[PDB]
Amino acid sequence: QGVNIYNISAGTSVDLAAPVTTGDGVTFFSSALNLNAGAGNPNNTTLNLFAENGAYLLHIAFRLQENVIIFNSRQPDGPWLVEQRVSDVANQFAGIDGKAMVTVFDHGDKYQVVINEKTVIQYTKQISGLTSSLSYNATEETSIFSTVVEAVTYTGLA
Amino acid sequence: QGVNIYNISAGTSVDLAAPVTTGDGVTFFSSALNLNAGAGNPNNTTLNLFAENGAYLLHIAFRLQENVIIFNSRQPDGPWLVEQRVSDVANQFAGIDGKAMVTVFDHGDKYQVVINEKTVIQYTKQISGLTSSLSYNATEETSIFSTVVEAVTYTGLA
Fold it and tell me: What is the DSSP string of B47-84?
């Protein structure tokens, strides 16, 4: 029922005018696809969905040197929970280059993560709740995506 | 659910691998915004949704000179049905400049057209059915959007 555009600058987070919940979706658009970037520290780029208390509902980290993608969750003060992994970074972004889009579907009990047209993981939730803020962490010198990512949100749906 | 990406060059159309149906959505992304494009005849740009038969489920036409976004429909060999209007084009895109996006949600009885964040019209369908074809018609000289517009679909939702 509603569309919201957010211009997330690398290293910052943002509050949503419309909360993301079951039936909703968010898509992080990047205007570049740096697959020859430096080495992550240890991450090159991260995309996250936070709960109102600050807990990471979905933490997605890309690591080129380690050539793997990380998927986890953690309460605002708690420890990183059970790690989920997927090898072959460059392979996910296949078919499309010069840019890339990452989508997260809030299926209620699971977060479907889609890179371009390819579903990379049907991530079972370790923490529930609606998402009120997103973030994009990376440094200009080593992020796989553009310095400014455009996360567009589609809410109201259900 | 699934995500589909289609690059559409001005004047062409494309078959969807996944049809847009009730509860689904499409977002055409333009890398440019030209509000001084020139004289359309009478259209500067049009975005469309067709069904197998070829019917115009929804015909979105942008017109700078006439300063109006027209919305209509029509059967295969039929005449245009009842036109709907939204005056002042530049005003709908107010908010972002170097680019723009147009989303279309299929809510069964109505098509909800949203330009960027602004919902421009609650178009009650004059013809129902599934969308098998997306289309972007314009010339490389008078289009308000970039020469190639990227259509992204969100399906399987409901």
Answer: EEEE-TT--EEEEEEEETTTTEEEEEEE-TTPPP---E
Alpha helices in A63-155 (DSSP H): 89-92
Q: How far apart are CA A37 and CA A42, in angstroms?
A: 13
- Which one, of A41, A42, A46, lies nearest residue A30 by Cα? A46
Nearest by Cα to B154 from A32, A99, A152, A10:
A152
Q: How far is B8 from chain A (nearest CA, A)?
A: 15
Taking an 8 Å cut-off on Cβ atoms, the answer to whether A119 and B2 are in contact is yes
Contact yes or no for B154/A158 (Cβ under 8 A): no
The answer to whether B112 contacts chain A (CB < 8 Å) is yes
Chosen for mutation from A1, A3, A123 (greatest number of chain B CBs closer than 10 Å) is A3
Task: List the Cα angle A94/A98/A104 in 5-degree steps.
Answer: 60
Longest dimension (CA), chain B: 41
Cβ atoms within 10 A of the Cβ of B41, count? 10
Q: Domain residues for B51?
A: 1-158
B153: contact with A, CB 8 A cutoff? no
CB A100 within 8 A of CB A93: yes
- The domain total for chain B is 1
* B4 contacts in chain A (CB < 8 Å): 117
Answer yes or no: do A23 and B103 touch at CB < 8 A.
no
Residue B29 tokens read as 């992304």
CA–CA distance, B47 with B141 (Å, rounded to integer): 17
Cβ distance B103 to A25 less than 8 Å, yes or no, reads no
Expressed in Å, this structure's resolution amounts to 2.7
- CA-to-CA distance for A5 and B96, rounded, in angstroms? 10
**Dihedral class, residue A80 (left if φ above 0, else alpha if ψ from -120 to 50, else beta):** beta
CATH of the domain at A156: 2.60.120.200
